[PDB]
Chains A and B, each alone.
Chain A
């Protein structure tokens, strides 16, 4: 039924970007989703956001810039050992000028660019550009 709620969040983000609306409602909340949007915010692709704290499970409302072509989730959360990123680079990123990958390292939810410097690797959550 309800599984991998990161996908449920990011397909709503995708439909709202393709439609052209301003702000999205997402009924589940995860620390995964919050740190994912933190990476997207720090790299500037979204705007400011706000978490309605339900006692049960909150709801995230995100102001949208309008730059987001495509965000999404790789489904089974594959492992990625280092010196195996370049497969995912050529397979997922639209170019060698932009695009980002969200790894899950032991030292936090990191970025494709911070991961190669921190020299960790780990599991893939998703991608956005």
Chain B
């Protein structure tokens, strides 16, 4: 069951039971980490980088081939986003919906969806302030949104 929808469908992914990479792809941890640094310098989302290594380089779930999660691989040499992606995409769409209400200041549906999006933002912000990845006095009104697009 989704949150802000009656739609309770199932569109998921399912990892297999089998652990680390089967036979082919003679590609050790060092080469994988060098690939992921060269991609993160080009600055893609880790969600995107998983898809790139899945489709091009034939890399499975990277937890198996490296032993370590990809954002931990990212942070341990410090190519960090410094604003995490799961908040970043919500702020990125909230900026656009604010702008859309401004040039169409009658769109009640977009107004309601803006309220839902800001609610999701406050939920994830309380989560990140609990798990201490963010400064505790972090706020979000308008200007932080317009800056950190």
Taking beta carbons and an 8 Å cutoff, which residues of A are in contact with B?
1, 54-55
B1-A54 in contact (CB<8A): no
A-B contact pairs, 4 of them (CB 8 A): A1-B1, A54-B17, A55-B15, A55-B17
Q: What's the dominant secondary structure at chain B's contact region?
A: loop
Residues of B within 8 A of A1 (CB): 1
Interface residues of B in 1-58 (CB under 8 A from A): 1, 15, 17
| Distance from B16 Cβ to chain A, minimum over Cβ atoms (Å) | 9
Taking beta carbons and an 8 Å cutoff, which residues of B are in contact with A?
1, 15, 17
Query: Which are the 4 A-B pairs with shortest beta-carbon distances?
Result: A55-B17, A1-B1, A54-B17, A55-B15
Residues of B within 8 A of A55 (CB): 15, 17
Residues of A within 8 A of B17 (CB): 54-55
B16: nearest residue on chain A (CB-CB)? Answer: A55
CA A55 to CA B17, docked complex, whole Å: 6
| Distance from A34 Cβ to chain B, minimum over Cβ atoms (Å) | 20
| Distance from A76 Cβ to chain B, minimum over Cβ atoms (Å) | 24
A56: nearest residue on chain B (CB-CB)? Answer: B15
